[PDB]
Nucleic acid binder design. Structure first.
Length: 1117
RNA sequence: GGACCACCCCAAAAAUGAAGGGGACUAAAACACAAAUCUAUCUGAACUUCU
């Protein structure tokens, strides 16, 4: 019986009591909802025809008691009178079950009132510490210090041994294995015999409640009532005497037999009672054996102790004198703390992209250095430091640094200046340290707009000139023009069809601060699916070429996309406009649909009670309902809150596209006699743009300038100085982190209800016209292609041998390079000599006969891909004969087997499997940074929670800093280890665990705490001297303080492997060590109906599937 | 040490059903103008409807 998450209501805890709260207003809804749940649904109260019809009848009928009346509500002998549609003497049968329903509601009503806000900053002897006020947090605050931690473990072991006696558990493990279904009560009623409730309710329940009223002291109650159970005496001390008695070492032991009994009950509710669950039967052996169970419960109370101490440190920076942490505070706090862990992550990628752009052989980072400034010696006071930008000019890498600078920036550098460039790398490195110090100074003052302030940083002569040549209104016109050309618009439209387009649609480049809008891709893809379900009148372009259709749709998307973000979202979100005209329409289109008029079970019924009076506030209510009902649906689904919100922005867009009034975008697209006249138009303009990247200010031809005269822009940033440094960070970022940085700045604005990065998000969108997808005229040294190719068993290195290698000239084709898109990302992040070593171990090479088979099968896919689409059409919509007999089935099987063995073979010689491998290795390493950033935030929280004094702890978590008294030099791990040694100076072996001889094994193997500097600096990527399965091993050792993070390491790695089409079965041995048992590429099922003949056509090739398993296991030497 | 196959919080006279609830409160995800294609689509309830 779910109580919350049903309207907009949710349990939100407050100062005086916890409260059921309708989404926005803080009024009490606890009495309103719990009176509404006080009803007996009459289908409970009961092959598939008589049963299935009666359940639909009595689900409408509810039996409630308002007020002490048995009247029924619309949605045995007394049950049939309702079925024959025909008072109080009859319905008194149900009060036996409604009194059990009433007592559940009164117990839940008291369950919400005690779930109140706990954490309160206090001020005892001039230090600001945070304590809990709840009954449990009084126990955790007693054992808060690290000295009393061993007494906390012993009291759990003492309480566990008084409740569970090694054969009561041993019989209880047997009953969990020896059930399948409907036998839960035998486990349950035996477990109540272990606790002993039958000699508790019947002997002490009514006795002890009288004596609580008299003696008002636990010491006097035990003297008054002797011979209590050790668990019952533990329960009374928790409820009636824990708030108001002082905690001695003798009376602290009463609270632990109740804390252990909760944990054993929570294990039964998850692994026995509810759903069993779907996990295993081998899991149960690991959980419930007595020596494992005694270890697991104390490994779970020590988790709950450490989350308290971590919360007392987290709520010490974020809270004033002065305040109690209500759920309004806590939820806003988490969305600001998740903001910080995304800016720590964006400065770890920006270091990493600055290490590839300036190739360091040491892979050792970065201060201080990257400009030449001398410093005084101990003797003589005369030296010159080793600046890495001056290490260019010793190795003469300036032909290669300028090559790496071109991939990130597209500015024409001149390495002969060499003082202008060393000032440019200073302004990149000072910009990353500026947002690094912003994380520190978002503690004393909660203003996130000042972490991108970039104060006291003057831009270079390059970075000023580079920014103004990417903002001014003439250059943005030649990026709109490049996006129009690259989307094949000039080839599939007439000249006046697009001049009429450019006179109307304006290009902004304004964030508009609207939450939860769908992207237009993922919304264009729904059109042909939803075309019949909604009154759309659209025609997706269909042509018999299927490479022409991909290029018309790529022009169909881009032309409608600038309508969607530019003109549409200003119309569709103004208070004048049709938002609720469409929102009430789609709820009616689902209600008045067929087969929902049969049974009124349409899914959009839970939206009809929402009005909200504003289209912008309506989304913030739907996006609030979405965030509270995430994680309920399994497999998961097309989720309702996103599916409903994609219908509004697609019905409303196609209504905005019909009314006023451009609708010639359908027939783009149609006149084949026109496309002959525009066939070479894309080639003439692309030849111009390659002459534009070689030199900008040449000349603009007349046919170019007729488009550029009409392209209109919304807003220009006008060059403030602090955006100049924020631009240099964003060019050092891939697309996945750049949208995470786009998302985290939007979620900061919607959480704090202010606009603070509206100048920053406007500059992210001026990088949204920069992704070119024909990337990026980089050089392709032909030796570097040929480390993956084997010409007669040897790597092709000579450029003449590459022409000798192939014949069909899908490679070299002199005198040029075919320049595949896969080698862009593998070289920008290179990670190019690494994937040589992985491919050499796995034998992944491009054979001659395997490349020769490519050009044979390439002239056969167009026969196979067309024949697959034709036979699939007989399967989906026959409409004529109700055929697709078995002779069509076997012909469809041989069609998709040939597409499968070609697409696996196309992706190998087009290097798309290396672009998938590089995309997979880097996606894992960008995710594991996000766990070491949680570790850095939760490291200062445990230390500030343990020690509210000792202000030197904050001096650990600084990054230059020149101010520190005790911990001067080093990064976080190098300064934490000397904090750890001077704290445990009397408690070896813990010093010798971090001793200077032990630390060399600890650092080289990247064990317990040196994996944090290893992951966050991306030190895997040049050499990989420790494998991923040992990085993931050492990260779970690092995150062992928090169990929800130690468990979510492997869950986030399996889910990354599942996005790239792999099903991973890891094994974790008896030693803490991870190995892959099996990888399989996930099966694309064809013909999902007909229930017997599926085809399973796996996505990634088996040769790539082996090659990923080597990548996790690859270690240097 | 065994992840994937979470975690935390509140509820013990009557109301021993702790056989219950809660969590944007806490992680994982999801949402976002990168990419990638061979999975009919569309309704629904804990396989079943559709033109």
């Amino acid at each position: 019986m779910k109580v919350t998450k049903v309207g907009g209501i949710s349990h939100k805890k407050y100062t005086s009591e916890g409260r059921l709260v309708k989404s926005e207003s803080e009024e009490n809804r606890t009495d309103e909802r719990l009176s509404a749940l006080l009803n007996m649904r009459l289908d409970m109260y009961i092959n598939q025809k008589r049963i299935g019809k009666l359940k639909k009848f009595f689900s409408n009928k509810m039996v409630y008691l308002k007020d002490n009346t048995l009247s029924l509500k619309n949605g045995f002998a007394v049950l049939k009178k309702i079925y024959l549609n025909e008072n109080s003497e009859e319905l008194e049968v149900f009060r036996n079950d409604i009194k059990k329903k009433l007592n559940k509601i009164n117990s839940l009503k008291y369950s919400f009132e005690k779930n109140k806000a706990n954490y309160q900053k206090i001020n005892e002897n001039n230090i600001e510490k945070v304590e809990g006020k709840s009954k449990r947090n009084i126990i955790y605050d007693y054992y808060r210090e690290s000295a009393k931690r061993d007494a906390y473990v012993s009291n759990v072991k003492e309480a566990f041994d008084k409740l569970y006696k090694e054969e009561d558990i041993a019989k209880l493990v047997l009953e969990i294995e020896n059930l399948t279904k409907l036998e839960k009560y035998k486990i349950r009623e035996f477990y109540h015999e272990i606790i002993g409730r039958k000699n508790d309710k019947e002997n002490f329940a009514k006795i002890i409640y009288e004596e609580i009223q008299n003696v008002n002291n636990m010491k006097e109650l035990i003297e008054k009532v002797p011979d209590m159970s050790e668990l019952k005496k533990s329960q009374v001390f928790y409820k009636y005497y824990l708030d108001k008695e002082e905690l001695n070492d003798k009376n602290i032991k009463y609270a632990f037999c109740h804390f252990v009994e909760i944990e054993m009950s929570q294990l039964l509710k998850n692994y026995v009672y509810k759903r069993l669950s779907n996990i295993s039967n081998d899991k149960i052996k690991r959980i419930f054996e007595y020596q494992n169970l005694k270890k697991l419960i104390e490994n779970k109370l020590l988790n709950k102790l450490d989350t308290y101490v971590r919360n007392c440190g987290k709520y010490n920076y974020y809270l004033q004198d002065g305040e109690i942490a209500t759920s309004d505070f806590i939820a806003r706090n988490r969305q600001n703390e998740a903001f910080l862990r995304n800016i720590i992550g964006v400065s770890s990628v920006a270091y990493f992209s600055l290490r590839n752009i300036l190739e360091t052989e040491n892979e050792n980072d970065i201060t201080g250095r990257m400009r030449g400034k001398t410093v005084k010696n101990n003797k003589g006071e005369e030296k010159y430091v080793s600046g890495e930008v001056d290490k260019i000019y010793n190795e003469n890498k300036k032909n290669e640094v300028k090559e790496n600078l071109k991939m990130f920036y597209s500015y024409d550098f001149n390495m002969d200046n060499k003082n202008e460039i060393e000032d440019f790398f200073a302004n990149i490195d000072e910009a990353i340290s500026s947002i690094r110090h912003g994380i520190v100074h978002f503690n004393l003052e909660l203003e996130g707009k000042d972490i991108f302030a970039f104060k006291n940083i003057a831009p270079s002569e390059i970075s000023k000139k580079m920014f103004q040549n990417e903002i001014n209104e003439k250059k943005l016109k030649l990026k709109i023009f490049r996006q129009l050309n690259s989307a094949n618009v000039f080839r599939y439209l007439e000249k006046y069809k697009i001049l009429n387009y450019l006179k109307r649609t304006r290009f902004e480049f304004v964030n508009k601060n609207i939450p939860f809008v769908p992207s237009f891709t993922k919304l264009y893809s729904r059109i042909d699916d939803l075309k019949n379900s909604l009154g759309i009148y659209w025609k997706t372009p269909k042509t018999n070429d299927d490479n022409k259709t991909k290029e018309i749709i790529d022009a169909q998307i881009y032309l409608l996309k600038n309508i969607y973000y530019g003109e549409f979202l200003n119309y569709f979100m103004s208070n004048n406009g049709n938002f609720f005209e469409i929102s009430k329409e789609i709820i009616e289109l689902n209600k008045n649909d067929k087969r929902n008029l049969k049974t009124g079970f349409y899914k959009l019924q839970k939206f009809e009670d929402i009005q909200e009076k504003i289209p912008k506030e309506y989304l913030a209510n739907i996006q609030s309902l979405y965030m509270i009902n995430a994680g309920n649906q399994d497999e998961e689904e097309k989720d309702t809150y996103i599916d409903f919100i994609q219908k509004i922005f697609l019905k409303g867009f196609m209504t905005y596209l019909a009314n006023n009034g451009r609708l010639s975008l359908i027939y783009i697209g149609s006149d084949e006699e026109t496309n002959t006249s525009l066939a070479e138009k894309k080639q003439e303009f692309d030849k111009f743009l390659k002459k534009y990247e070689q030199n900008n200010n040449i000349k603009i031809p007349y046919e170019i300038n007729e488009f550029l005269r009409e392209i209109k822009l919304g807003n220009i940033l006008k060059y403030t100085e602090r955006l100049n440094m924020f631009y240099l960070i964003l060019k050092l970022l891939n697309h996945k982190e750049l949208t995470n940085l786009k998302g985290s700045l939007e979620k900061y604005q919607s959480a704090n209800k202010e606009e603070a990065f509206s100048d920053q998000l406007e500059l992210i969108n001026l990088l949204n016209l920069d992704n070119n997808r024909v990337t990026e005229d980089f050089e392709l040294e032909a030796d570097e292609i040929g480390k993956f190719l084997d010409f007669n068993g040897n790597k092709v290195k000579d450029n003449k041998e590459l022409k000798k290698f192939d014949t069909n000239k899908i490679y070299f084709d002199g005198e040029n390079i075919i320049k595949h898109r896969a080698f862009y990302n593998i070289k920008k992040y290179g990670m190019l000599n690494l994937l040589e070593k992985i491919a050499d171990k796995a034998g992944y090479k491009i054979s001659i006969e395997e490349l020769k088979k490519y050009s044979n099968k390439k002239n056969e896919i167009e026969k196979n891909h067309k024949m697959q689409e034709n036979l699939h059409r007989k399967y989906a919509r026959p409409r004529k004969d109700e055929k697709f007999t078995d002779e069509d089935y076997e012909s469809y099987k041989q069609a998709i087997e040939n597409i499968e063995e070609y697409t696996h073979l196309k992706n190998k010689v087009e290097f798309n499997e290396l672009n998938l491998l590089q995309g997979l290795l880097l996606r894992i390493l960008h995710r594991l940074v996000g766990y070491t950033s949680i570790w850095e935030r939760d490291l200062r929280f445990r230390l500030k929670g343990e020690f509210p004094e000792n202000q030197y702890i904050e001096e650990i978590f600084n990054f230059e800093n020149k101010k520190n008294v005790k911990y001067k030099g080093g990064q976080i791990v190098e300064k934490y280890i000397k904090f750890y040694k001077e704290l445990h100076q009397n408690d070896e072996v813990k010093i010798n665990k971090y001793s200077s001889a032990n630390i060399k094994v600890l650092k080289q193997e990247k064990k317990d705490l040196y994996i944090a500097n290893y992951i966050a600096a991306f030190n895997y990527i040049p050499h990989a001297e420790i494998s991923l399965l040992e990085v993931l091993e050492n990260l779970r050792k690092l995150l062992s303080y928090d169990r929800k993070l130690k468990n979510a390491v492997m869950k986030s790695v399996v889910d990354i492997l599942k996005e790239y089409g792999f099903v991973a079965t890891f094994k974790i041995g008896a030693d803490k060590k991870i190995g892959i048992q099996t990888l399989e590429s996930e099966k694309i099922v064809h013909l999902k109906n007909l229930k017997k003949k599926k085809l399973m056509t796996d996505r990634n090739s088996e040769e790539l599937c082996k090659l990923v398993k080597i990548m996790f296991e690859y270690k240097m030497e």
